[PDB]
Amino acid sequence: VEDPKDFPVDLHAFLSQAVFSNRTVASFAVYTTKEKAQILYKKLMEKYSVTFISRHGFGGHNILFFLTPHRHRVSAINNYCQKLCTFSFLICKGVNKEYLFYSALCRQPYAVVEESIQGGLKEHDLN
């Protein structure tokens, strides 16, 4: 009932709303439970050989942010993520603003719980 219908409003700027689009992208964000995000963190690594992935706390919920070496459809990533939820909510969107989205997720009200590279992203890695 009180499950979020979208990402927090302060992150909407960094996100594509075209969840059914045909355009393949390489930057993704997932909003779900801490339970489901803890699971997807590793499963996405082995599914999409992600170049970077980071997990970010927000109250009880989590935001996963990841980059893939090949482009994918957002609907494809979401479909995979939806398999590993059942009754848990899950919001999956393409990220149009990679290092800035990430930096918002590294500051209040968010916090980085874990990430696949020590020190996380450097802005020069994306540029």
Numbering used by the authors: 133 to 259
The paper states:
A conserved feature of Polyomavirus T-antigens is a phenylalanine situated at the C-termini of their origin-binding domains (OBDs). T-ag is the only virally encoded protein needed for replication; therefore, it has been the target of numerous studies designed to understand its multiple roles during the duplication of the viral genome. One of the interesting findings of the JCV T-ag OBD structure was the presence of a C-terminal "pocket". This structure also revealed that the pocket serves as the binding site for T-ag residues from the A1/B2 loops situated on a neighboring OBD subunit. The initial function of the A1 and B2 loops is site-specific DNA binding to the viral origin.
JCV T-ag containing the F258L mutation, which is located in the C-terminus of the OBD, was unable to support T-ag dependent JCV DNA replication. The F258L JCV T-ag OBD crystallized in the I41 space group, diffracted to 2.7 Å and contained one molecule in the asymmetric unit cell. As with the wt JCV OBD, the topology of the OBD F258L mutant is a five-stranded antiparallel B-sheet sandwiched, on either side, by two helices. The A1 loop is the "DNA free" or "apo-conformation" (; reviewed in). Inspection of Fig 4B establishes that the previously described C-terminal pocket is also a feature of the JCV T-ag OBD F258L mutant. The crystallography experiments establish that the overall structures of the apo forms of the wt and F258L JCV T-ag OBDs are quite similar and that the structural consequences of the F258L mutation appear to be localized to the pocket. For example, the H-bond formed between N259 and R155 is lost and many non-bonded interactions made between the C-terminus and the A1 and B2 motifs are altered. Moreover, L258 causes disruptions to many of the non-bonded interactions and the L258 mutation also causes the loss (e.g., N259-R155) and acquisition (e.g., D257-F152) of several hydrogen bonds. That the changes are localized to the pocket, and not transmitted to other regions of the JCV T-ag OBD, is supported by the observation that the F258L mutation has little to no impact on A1 and B2 loop dependent site-specific binding to duplex DNA.
